[PDB]
Design a protein around this nucleic acid. Structure first.
Ligand code: MG
Ligand code: MG
Ligand code: MG
Ligand code: MG
Ligand code: MG
Ligand code: MG
Ligand code: MG
Ligand code: MG
Ligand code: MG
Ligand code: MG
Ligand code: MG
Ligand code: MG
Ligand code: MG
Ligand code: MG
Ligand code: MG
Ligand code: MG
Ligand code: MG
Ligand code: MG
Lengths: 114, 100, 98, 81, 104, 119
RNA sequence: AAACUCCAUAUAUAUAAUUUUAAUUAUAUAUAAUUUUAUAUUAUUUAUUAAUAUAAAGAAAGGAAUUAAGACAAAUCAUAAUGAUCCUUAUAAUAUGGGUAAUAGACGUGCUAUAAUAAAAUGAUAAUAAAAUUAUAUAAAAUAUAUUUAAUUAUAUUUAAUUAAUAAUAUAAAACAUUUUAAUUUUUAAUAUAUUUUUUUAUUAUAUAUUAAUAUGAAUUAUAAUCUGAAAUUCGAUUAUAUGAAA
């Protein structure tokens, strides 16, 4: 009982902090439990099925833990862990994007003169 | 004026059967958009990289002849020993056997 | 267009006085010559202010009425031109060729 | 306003002891709707630090449990002048 | 700070001329929750009235009866709309589905 | 001035707009109504109405929850929110925004409008 | 500092078998300007001189990137990394909720008004753009309801085509015709007029009765209802009838 999460998962290869670990665990568990949520949601919001099936599906969908919620996946700076002003094109926060662009790491980015 | 609505509906039924499309005259909430959606789980999970990237630890099991050493970890160990000698350090953590 | 040009030339002041507080009290104003653009603006502001005092809900109608009045010489800004010209005649003395 | 066709928001909370016995239902589920079955049951709704007791009336039906458990209490400016 | 309306000089009602006070009242019929009707004297100009909630449909006054339906005012407020708004769920299925929670 | 249900009107006015303007429960659609039912043409000026038409309008409006009654509905609903001990109830009582509006910088309105007994 | 550079400019040359058409285009290379002369006038280190005048020839006129040294112990240990310290059953980890969102007076920066040089409704052989986005998408047409011929706006139902110089987001909108538009007796009816007829001239009504309180404004509230989500109670955006405050 020395692991901070119910199910053991690997470690990100690069920058690692506690919030990155939380987000990664949520991402992975959502990946393995994304089919269940879609099926349960269809059953619980379908009118044609019996209302008892609908009720039980909705109850279980509500009872699902938080680490399988699509709403709790947040984008973070893969180089810093910062979760503000994150460009999805590079998975980098604003300042890390600036420094990597000026340093040449990004594949095709360049300063804007126009 | 326009084509009979029954004729339009019949054409719709036939085309839907041919092309394998759902048909719903009444317009009830079938919730088919809940199912006909892509699984974004793989892409979402593969966000922080590949966890199996080679690490400095594995260089002993692979190429054991080369005697590598990492400045970062040596710096960490040197700082720890320096703290001990200077008198600072980390208090001993009491084991799990204490407390109720 | 000719009537409008004549009206502007007759209603636009020929001189005007600006403040020169760098000298002595009363700003020591000197009349200064104006260009065609400045004279036209001074005339047009008066024409518009006199046209806005009419009744028609349409600015085109009000402005046409006012321009017709000025063409027939019933403008209410001739006295403004006259006051400005008299002030210039009074301050002639302060003129100093720079 | 939650769409009616979705159905009322219902969460697993204990009611069998609430009716068979007089045990109140202490809960943090502030977003659950008050169904017609809860009238006469005693609830203890979490407000952030303490559980506020409330008895369900026939008029509360359709509302949310969290509407009767204020989380922040009123402001009072201390002028001292 | 108090507000009062002024007192006018009271008309003197002499000894022996003082009549009693007989206010105008109507023999009004008053229907209870059941079919029972009581005649009473009322000053309101309404000869007929019926009650929706009264003694004849109160548990405290009616202990022996097994079944007793209760009702309130109609066409007022949002009453009964918490039921009218949900038609999919209707009356014993919910009772069965409320068997237990299985939490500890 | 013409009068319908004891409200002074003006002869230049249009019925379809004046009804909504000076009745609590009338608006665009419900003023297109009444006019449509009684056959008054879309832009009558209300100085063209005959007395039978005036009383017909009066009867039709009296056949609706138009004024006073609608105020009663709204007041009763707010009173019920207070009675049930709702957050909205105390917002109304304290004269504060009830639809989740920031109160930190400007709530000048509803300080002078929100109350238990609203118009 | 200037130049060199990028977006723009002109020309050419090369690619596209002009059905990824936008050839009126796309982007690869080069040229051009940090413009040349000719007489005029003031002048003047005398002609070798500038400031203008402007016959001429040129397509030729902009924009942004770059902001040195020193400083203000300017901001940043909350982008991350760090020396000293200071927490080690906490100052380190998890979840359920509640905080960041409260409201007396202040203060910034914005949005929307307060009407006639100006705001709404209509404009289907659909007046006229540029630059972006779409495999963690996109939503054409069509059909249903709010609402009755439609249309227009909101939701649902189906999802066509395209991972895209090809489908889609997406018929830009203001302009510009037309109708209307309270304060305004500046108006609308009734009859009569007649060569102003989408119109004017008469006599009556439109007068609690001419200097601000709508047919402007859309804040604040009541009630259906709908999106997204497991879930809007504290706290999310939406149409619908009502509400219609300050200005
Ligand atoms: Mg570290
Ligand atoms: Mg998110
Ligand atoms: Mg009104
Ligand atoms: Mg430079
Ligand atoms: Mg410097
Ligand atoms: Mg500081
Ligand atoms: Mg750090
Ligand atoms: Mg904040
Ligand atoms: Mg700023
Ligand atoms: Mg306007
Ligand atoms: Mg507007
Ligand atoms: Mg167009
Ligand atoms: Mg384009
Ligand atoms: Mg469509
Ligand atoms: Mg327009
Ligand atoms: Mg308006
Ligand atoms: Mg608004
Ligand atoms: Mg608002």
């Amino acid at each position: 009982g020395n692991f901070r999460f119910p199910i053991k998962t690997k470690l990100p290869p690069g920058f690692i902090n506690a919030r990155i670990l939380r987000d990664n665990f949520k991402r992975q568990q959502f990946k393995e439990n994304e089919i269940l949520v879609k099926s349960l949601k269809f059953i619980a919001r379908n009118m044609n099925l019996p209302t008892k099936l609908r009720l039980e599906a909705q109850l279980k969908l509500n009872a699902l833990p938080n680490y399988m919620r699509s709403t709790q996946i947040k984008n973070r700076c893969v180089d810093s862990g910062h979760a503000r002003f994150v460009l999805s094109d590079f998975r980098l926060c604003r300042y890390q994007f600036r420094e990597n662009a000026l340093k040449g790491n990004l594949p095709g980015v360049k300063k804007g003169i126009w | 004026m326009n084509v009979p609505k029954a004729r339009l509906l019949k054409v719709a039924e036939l085309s839907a059967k041919i092309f394998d499309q759902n048909f719903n005259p009444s317009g009830i909430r079938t919730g088919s958009k809940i199912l006909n959606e892509r699984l974004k789980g793989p892409s979402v999970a593969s966000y922080y990289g590949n966890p199996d990237i080679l690490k400095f630890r594995h260089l002993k099991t692979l190429y054991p002849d080369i005697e590598f050493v990492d400045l970062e970890e040596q710096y960490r160990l040197s700082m720890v020993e320096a703290k001990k000698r200077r008198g600072k350090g980390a208090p001993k953590k009491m084991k799990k056997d204490a407390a109720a | 267009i000719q009537a409008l040009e004549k009206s502007l030339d007759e209603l636009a002041p020929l001189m005007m006085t600006k403040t020169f507080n760098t000298g002595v009290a009363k700003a020591s104003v000197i009349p200064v010559p104006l260009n065609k653009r400045q004279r036209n603006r001074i005339a047009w502001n008066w024409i518009v202010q006199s046209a806005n005092q009419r009744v028609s809900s349409d600015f085109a109608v009000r402005l046409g009425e006012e321009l017709t009045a000025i063409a027939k010489g019933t403008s209410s800004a001739f006295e403004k031109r006259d006051q400005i010209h008299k002030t210039a005649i009074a301050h002639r003395a302060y003129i100093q060729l720079k | 306003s939650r769409s009616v066709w979705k159905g009322p928001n219902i969460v697993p909370l204990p009611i069998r002891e609430a009716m068979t016995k007089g045990t109140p239902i202490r809960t943090n589920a502030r977003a659950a709707t008050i169904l017609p079955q809860f009238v006469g049951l005693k609830f203890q709704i979490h407000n952030g630090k303490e559980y506020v007791p409330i008895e369900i009336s026939e008029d509360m039906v359709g509302h949310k449990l969290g509407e009767f458990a204020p989380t922040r209490k009123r402001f009072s400016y201390t002028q001292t002048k | 700070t108090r507000i009062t309306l002024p007192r006018r000089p009271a008309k003197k009602i002499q000894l022996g001329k003082s009549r009693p006070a007989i206010y105008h009242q109507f023999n009004v019929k008053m229907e209870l929750s059941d079919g029972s009707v009581v005649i009473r004297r009322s000053q309101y100009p309404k000869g007929e009235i019926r009650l929706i909630q009264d003694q004849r449909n109160n548990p405290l006054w009616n202990p022996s009866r097994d079944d007793l339906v209760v009702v309130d005012a109609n066409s007022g407020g949002s009453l009964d709309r918490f039921n009218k708004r949900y038609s999919s769920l209707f009356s014993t299925v919910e009772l069965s589905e409320e068997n237990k929670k299985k939490t500890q | 001035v013409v009068h319908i249900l004891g409200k002074g009107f003006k002869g230049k006015e249009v019925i379809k707009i004046a009804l909504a303007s000076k009745f609590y429960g009338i608006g665009k659609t419900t003023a297109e109504k009444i006019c449509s039912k009684l056959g008054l043409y879309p832009w009558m000026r209300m100085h063209q109405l005959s007395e039978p038409q005036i009383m017909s309008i009066a009867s039709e409006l009296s056949t609706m929850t138009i004024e006073g009654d609608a105020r009663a509905i709204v007041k009763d609903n707010i009173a019920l929110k207070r009675k049930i001990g709702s957050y909205s109830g105390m917002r109304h009582t304290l004269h504060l925004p009830v639809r989740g509006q920031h109160t930190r910088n400007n709530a000048k309105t509803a300080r002078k409008l929100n109350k238990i007994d609203r118009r």
